[PDB]
Swiss-Prot record:
<feature type="region of interest" description="WED-I (OBD-I)">
    <location>
        <begin position="1"/>
        <end position="35"/>
    </location>
</feature>
<feature type="site" description="Binds sequence-specific recognition of both target and non-target strand bases in PAM">
    <location>
        <position position="602"/>
    </location>
</feature>
<feature type="coiled-coil region">
    <location>
        <begin position="74"/>
        <end position="106"/>
    </location>
</feature>
<keyword id="KW-0456">Lyase</keyword>
<dbReference type="GO" id="GO:0004530">
    <property type="term" value="F:deoxyribonuclease I activity"/>
</dbReference>
<feature type="binding site">
    <location>
        <begin position="175"/>
        <end position="176"/>
    </location>
    <ligand>
        <name>crRNA</name>
    </ligand>
</feature>
<feature type="DNA-binding region" description="Target DNA">
    <location>
        <begin position="775"/>
        <end position="778"/>
    </location>
</feature>
<dbReference type="GO" id="GO:0003677">
    <property type="term" value="F:DNA binding"/>
</dbReference>
<feature type="region of interest" description="RuvC-III">
    <location>
        <begin position="1196"/>
        <end position="1240"/>
    </location>
</feature>
<dbReference type="GO" id="GO:0051607">
    <property type="term" value="P:defense response to virus"/>
</dbReference>
<feature type="site" description="Binds crRNA">
    <location>
        <position position="805"/>
    </location>
</feature>
<protein>
    <recommendedName>
        <fullName>CRISPR-associated endonuclease Cas12a</fullName>
        <ecNumber>3.1.21.1</ecNumber>
        <ecNumber>4.6.1.22</ecNumber>
    </recommendedName>
</protein>
<feature type="binding site">
    <location>
        <begin position="47"/>
        <end position="51"/>
    </location>
    <ligand>
        <name>crRNA</name>
    </ligand>
</feature>
<dbReference type="InterPro" id="IPR040882">
    <property type="entry name" value="Cas12a_NUC"/>
</dbReference>
<feature type="binding site">
    <location>
        <begin position="307"/>
        <end position="310"/>
    </location>
    <ligand>
        <name>crRNA</name>
    </ligand>
</feature>
<keyword id="KW-0175">Coiled coil</keyword>
<feature type="active site" description="For DNase activity of RuvC domain">
    <location>
        <position position="1196"/>
    </location>
</feature>
Amino acid sequence: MTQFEGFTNLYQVSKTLRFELIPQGKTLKHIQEQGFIEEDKARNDHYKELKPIIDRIYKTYADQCLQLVQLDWENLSAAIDSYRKEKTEETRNALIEEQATYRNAIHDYFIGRTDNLTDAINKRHAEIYKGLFKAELFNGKVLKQLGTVTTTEHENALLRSFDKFTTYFSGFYENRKNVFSAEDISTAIPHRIVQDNFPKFKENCHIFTRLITAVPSLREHFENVKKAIGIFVSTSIEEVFSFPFYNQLLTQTQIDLYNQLLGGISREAGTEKIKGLNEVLNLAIQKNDETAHIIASLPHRFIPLFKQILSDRNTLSFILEEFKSDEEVIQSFCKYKTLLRNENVLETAEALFNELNSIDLTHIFISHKKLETISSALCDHWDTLRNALYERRISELKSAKEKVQRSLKHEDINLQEIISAAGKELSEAFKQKTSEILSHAHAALDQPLPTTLKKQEEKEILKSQLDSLLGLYHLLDWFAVDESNEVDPEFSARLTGIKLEMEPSLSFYNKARNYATKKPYSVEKFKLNFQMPTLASGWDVNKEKNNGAILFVKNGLYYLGIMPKQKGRYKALSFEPTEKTSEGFDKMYYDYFPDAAKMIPKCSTQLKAVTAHFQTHTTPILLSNNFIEPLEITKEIYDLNNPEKEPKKFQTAYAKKTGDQKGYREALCKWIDFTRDFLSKYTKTTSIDLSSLRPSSQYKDLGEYYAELNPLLYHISFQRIAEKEIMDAVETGKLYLFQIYNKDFAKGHHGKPNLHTLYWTGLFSPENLAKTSIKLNGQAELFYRPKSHEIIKDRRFTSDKFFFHVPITLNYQAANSPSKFNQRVNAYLKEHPETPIIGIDRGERNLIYITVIDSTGKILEQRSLNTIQQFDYQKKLDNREKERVAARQAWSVVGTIKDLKQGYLSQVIHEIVDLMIHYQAVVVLENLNFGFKSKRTGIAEKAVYQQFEKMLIDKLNCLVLKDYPAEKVGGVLNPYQLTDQFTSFAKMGTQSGFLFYVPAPYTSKIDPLTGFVDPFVWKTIKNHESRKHFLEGFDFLHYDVKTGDFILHFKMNRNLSFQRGLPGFMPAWDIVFEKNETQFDAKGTPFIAGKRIVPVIENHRFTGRYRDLYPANELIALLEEKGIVFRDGSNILPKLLENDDSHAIDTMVALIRSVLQMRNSNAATGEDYINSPVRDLNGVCFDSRFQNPEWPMDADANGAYHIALKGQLLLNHLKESKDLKLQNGISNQDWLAYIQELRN
RNA sequence: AAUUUCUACUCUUGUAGAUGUGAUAAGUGGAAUGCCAUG
DNA sequence: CATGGCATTCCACTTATCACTAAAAGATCGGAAG
DNA sequence: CTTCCGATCTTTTAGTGAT
């Protein structure tokens, strides 16, 4: 009999707290007189400058090592294909094994253990390999082996700035160690080569060979465009798309050559761009030929490869020069303005366009590709001028129209015919627009430049002048000045001269755009070090004179003490622990031993002396230093930890590989006895009680033993010291004292404290001291941020502050990772079949819409969360989004949206966890693909599909209710754990504890009452033949005279091609065209039944705005226009399908498509609702506007209700699941069949 | 209109909720500008 | 006045790893022997 | 004068997971 309260202390979590340190006493002066702050600032700047210099060495060895790589990729491609055809777990394991094999194979080059290279090269590469993670990067002991790096004197002098300070780069050492590593790490070199770039290359190879097989003419196109680009000249375009060529494309130069081949080299502004492979494929698409329709079906785009990790991009395309200061761009534009005003651009321009009223316009032509711009600038529609040209060429005449359009589409047109075409309105519009543009250019030229670019108004003034000049240049780019057609000579000469004078303005505009849109400089905190290489790395008493960090507790207040190096050496300041009754501070004593897997072999078996002893003679060795009794090590004890193979005989991987469970148990028992002896004899750990440990043979696995053992090694005690000693120490300067401070420690607070402050108080609560539930961690760091009733805005930004980030670890008694979390959750769920379900749906019209259903699916509560605590966050997000959109086009600062979304999601998360605790429910979200959420985030960054899942999973990883007592489940010492330990979204599966994932579609556009979904994908029908075929599948349609509504019948045995291929459980639906009368809801407002909201598509190619539709009214209007009688109640379809007019069938199909659009929304009126086209078997046509609380009110409420039903289906399958598992996703067929089973 | 920090209020020189930091790397999406095409 | 495919710059933004570390090893130097 | 040893401050290192 399990319980909901049993989901606590299942796995450890790690969190970091942040506090402001208040200086205590004279220590502010005593830190200013030493100048440590400026020293750490200069250290940080030197580190920032010197990080890319080391990266050159890493890039150099990466480029050198990969050029020697030679592998066959056939096996990896075969594994990828075999896993691609069917998704089963053993092919997944085979693919994982092949990926690991290839990853190790390439990593052997970096390690120096490959078989395809000589032994001397292997030794040289290994000798290099041992040096990039230690101090020889700075001393040059590994720098000489490459030689090609060629560091000059300034870097070498700046490398000596970090002397005796190599441990600063330790985090950087770990960061770089992830790169040259083979354990499927997403930042690593070989993971990228095997899993990121190679599947893309295989996809590109298969796409290219399918294109070649389908049609052969592009081979000449591809080879010719490759020769025009001039990349990979020594090899063929057939060979470049082959698996042996993937022995190249490891170094960044080859990848950049491939990418520039695929995209095409781009020259500077105003110059024709060399096309790429994807570009010529798109151009082949846009021809709209039958061969274009052939490759429209096929995948018609290659994929570029990803960048190499440590390298940098280089491109053959043009790179624009960059302005470096606002003064520089200001003086450059001022000198440009003086030059442009000295040559007198506007005088010759104005003199040039007034000739157009009085010159032979048969000799003035217009570029054919720019006439659309002229038409859009002169008319309300872009098509007008080309239509006028089309009908005049018709008027001076199937092949005739084709001749007209092919002369229209490519050949430049004389201006005289165009003025003859449009009439006069184009001529006065032309002269008026040219007058407006030169007036704008004149106003920009005369009005001067401001002194600087500090404020946004100066930026928009400069922007306004610049695009005035750009629009002028656009105006001169209208004319076709080329000599292929007739042109007046002096006209062409003056136009070319004024155009080349206007030419450098466009690149100037792009340069100013690049400089102006830079992020403004802000002050930023940096790590303090106090000249300690290992400041606050660990809290231990042995290291307290080295790490220098010591805490004190003073009558509920907390104080951090830092003692510095006195005269450049570690003067061991000491204190005498006095009686408790004496006044003073409470020093925390930190007796801790790290993870025994990481510690016992270090100080027992992997010692230098032991290794030297055992290679020579087999006799056992006694170890006495730092042991209170001499400790013996035997040959086989050393041999288990050092077996010359990866699987140790006490490791369960060896037991899995060989199956020798008996030998594994024996080796494990001997290892446990040995480490028990070590913990008995070691000086640090001889005082720690081990009586809670089980005997050796009772431990199932070594990791279980380690998870048991580690909590015993961590202990905290407190000692009282005289206040006089600490005050004298801080007054002397031998100790810097700071108070850990936040808002909650202020004397004026009365309310509930912050959750972080609750965590901090719970760690130092005496119950946590007695039994360690919340563990203080090491690796603390110090940050200094400079400067950036009576109440002051941004008071915390008014002075420099010292920050203090400290990590803590919770649920410490539990293991570092949970075991079978989802199986425990499913066991509890099977124990409690009546668990409620909460569905969370995300949308853009309304952000969060919740529905709570029971086991039988009845709604207990539904609610929109556009407003929490009477604050409509949706309007604020929408306002912020258009503010950002307007600012990003006005060259203003962009700002951030994350803080406002985080503030909304804080209240949202609190609401969901309150509902979770009050109902003991589960939470279901839709499984959103990364592509879909990224596309909708790009369409609308206001919406919150991402960052809500992360915050949810973070909150249920460890949950503490503030009102709860500290000892209760859900308290600070016993936090709830509802979700699995979050690793990453890639490995996060279909179920994370109490939170589930279901497939997205068929949750909104469906009937709640009946489960009906429209099956007709509408792209199957385009012409009247296919439309009439779609009508033939329907059974009959008649008019009901007693209710005024049409009744239409349909079966899935017809119109199967136009269906989306999902047969429902009902073989028949009764489509009803409700009479468009009005009804009153429960609130009493009138609403029109059967109404539809349809976009305007009258122009047949573009989408307009929204409009209301009344399908019964439109149907009777069309039928009475056709004269078809329907008051007899007869069948209407044969009376209608007999008529062969295409517009009647088009309108009928449009009405059918309109009436199945259950989703009816329009943001202009603020109305969104669902109507059911199919009447329920209880004689009800469902409409959400009736405001029945039994059913969803809105669209997103319906979607939330249906994902809750999907979760209900999953839990119902879980109840009959003997394996305590879940389905590998739910197909749409099973979901729709199940909901149709419930509804019918 | 105060906060380690963020959000929302302002009875309280404050309230409610949230808050895994640092380093590193990759990727995504907008906006502008061109170039080639299509409607 | 829109769409498709590229290219350059700028911005914000998300995702994915690592550490959460005491003690041995070693570099080094001031102080002690031949 | 000429040569080596013990204190002391950096630096690196050790590495576990289901019949």
